[PDB]
Automatic annotation (TrEMBL):
Belongs to the PBP/GOBP family. Keywords: Disulfide bond, Signal, Transport. It comes from Epiphyas postvittana. The keyword Disulfide bond applies. This is Pheromome Binding Protein. One of its GO terms (molecular function) is odorant binding. Disulfide bonds join 8-43, 39-93, 82-102.
Length: 113
């Protein structure tokens, strides 16, 4: 995950700030997230074989991060609905940033780090 972040950082030539952005993303401050944060999430998603989003590998990643059967299913359900909502976004970098924000914001009522 750090492996995949570090790889993507070198491939896409991102500053150390991408760390600041993903931390901010996670604490639900989206105001300063730019397209490149989207490109980072596409890059990481591909390397984790999460990419259209792959349902099965999503559930695997979720359990892999300590999600039980029930919560993993809820997470991927929320991720799919976000993916549908923003399916029509041209720019696949912007599409990923928007899905990621939709996802993070709508997983509120779930115990998952």
């Amino acid at each position: 995950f750090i492996k995949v972040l570090e790889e993507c950082k070198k491939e896409l030539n991102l500053s150390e700030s991408i760390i600041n952005d993903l931390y901010n993303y996670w604490k639900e401050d989206y105001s300063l997230l730019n397209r490149d944060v989207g490109c980072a999430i596409v890059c990481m998603s591909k390397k984790l074989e999460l990419i259209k989003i792959h349902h099965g590998n999503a559930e695997d990643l979720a359990k892999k991060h300590g999600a039980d059967s029930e919560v993993a299913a809820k997470l991927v359900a929320i991720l799919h609905e976000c993916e549908k909502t923003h399916d029509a976004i041209e720019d696949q970098c912007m599409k990923a940033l928007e899905i990621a924000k939709c996802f993070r914001t709508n997983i509120h009522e779930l115990n998952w780090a």
